[PDB]
Amino acid sequence: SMEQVAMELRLTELTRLLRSVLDQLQDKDPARIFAQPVSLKEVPDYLDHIKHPMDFATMRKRLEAQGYKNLHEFEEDFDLIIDNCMKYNARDTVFYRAAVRLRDQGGVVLRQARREVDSIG
Incomplete structure (x- = not known):
């Protein structure tokens, strides 16, 4: 149908907006602490502490x-990345400390993206 397209x-343009948002959030992590999932070879007990891991590549x-x-x-x-780290x-x-900074710096970007998604539907 023509509606489904x-x-x-829209989904595609939301995907295009979120990609820009994601790159902006990741630029706030220049040490790349949150780039990749926490390694289970290196932190084998991690899943006993954190039930829903998250990271920028995921x-x-x-x-x-x-x-x-x-x-x-x-x-x-995004909040999972931060909240997992802080626990x-x-x-x-x-x-x-890198998560506190990511959270504070992220807030500005996420504030404007809420307005942009409401504004442009």
């Missing part, structure tokens, strides 16, 4: 599979 044009695979239906689902995944790592660590 127009929806697909967000990218889902993004390019047009697997984010809306901004909320995308934001949930697993103590306050006085480079890792915990």
Whole structure:
């Protein structure tokens, strides 16, 4: 149908918006602490601590599979990256501190992307 295509044009443009957002969030992690999943060879107990791991490459695979239906689902995944880190790592660590910074810097980008998605449907 013609409706299914127009929806697909929107999903595709939402995917195009979220990719820009994702690159902007990732530029706020220049140390690349959050680029890749936490290694289970190196942190073998990780899954006993963290039930839903998340990272920027895993967000990218889902993004390019047009697997984010809306901004909320995308934001949930971003928040996981931060929240997982802040639980697993103590306050006085480079890792915990890198998440606090990513969160604070991300907030601005996510504020404007909420307005852009509402604004352009």
